[PDB]
Design a protein around this ligand. Structure first.
Ligand code: NAG
Length: 160
């Protein structure tokens, strides 16, 4: 009951996302009991902006850097934004996104290589970063869901 097994024995509890190769690209596959909800590496839930919150069109460089996804670059409202056209500076088009659909690829603990979700609640104490609670060895970790302590599933974060 609950959770879903995939890959080669990697079961990810419901409401749990995890990156996986679906041919020749990365895909966002999350377990929800009723089945894994895979979603190609599509843009983020854009909104507002001078593009009707439509979809983005990256990679899109700005200020001198090449952004592959949404970014708060120059954003003073908090949310992020993404170019709504291959040639951003060209059509000066863009669109705001939500928490740049953050996606952490954690592994270890009790999530077995699970796409750590951020933010993540820990002991009714909301969190937003690979916290080292209970660990004394350089191995920052986070919750595989919006409520780690609520699902009892954690995972180690990347090297950086
Ligand atoms: C964590 O944040 C969410 C949304 O901000 C809120 O609904 C939830 O109650 C918070 N958790 C705690 C323990 O305050």
């Amino acid at each position: 009951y609950g959770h879903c097994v995939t890959d080669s024995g990697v079961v990810y509890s419901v409401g749990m996302q995890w990156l996986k190769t679906q041919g020749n690209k990365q895909m966002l596959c999350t377990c929800l009991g009723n089945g894994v909800s895979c979603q190609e590496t599509a843009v983020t839930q854009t909104y507002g902006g001078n593009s009707n919150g439509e979809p983005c069109v990256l990679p899109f460089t700005y200020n001198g850097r090449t952004f592959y996804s949404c970014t708060t670059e120059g954003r003073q409202d908090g949310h992020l934004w993404c170019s709504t056209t291959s040639n951003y500076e060209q059509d000066q088009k863009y669109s705001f996104c939500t928490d740049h659909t953050v996606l952490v690829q954690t592994r270890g603990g009790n999530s077995n290589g699970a796409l750590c979700h951020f933010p993540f609640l820990y002991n009714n104490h909301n969190y937003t970063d690979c916290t080292s609670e209970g660990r004394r060895d350089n191995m920052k970790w986070c919750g595989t869901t919006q409520n780690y302590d609520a699902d009892q599933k954690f995972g180690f974060c990347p090297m950086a």
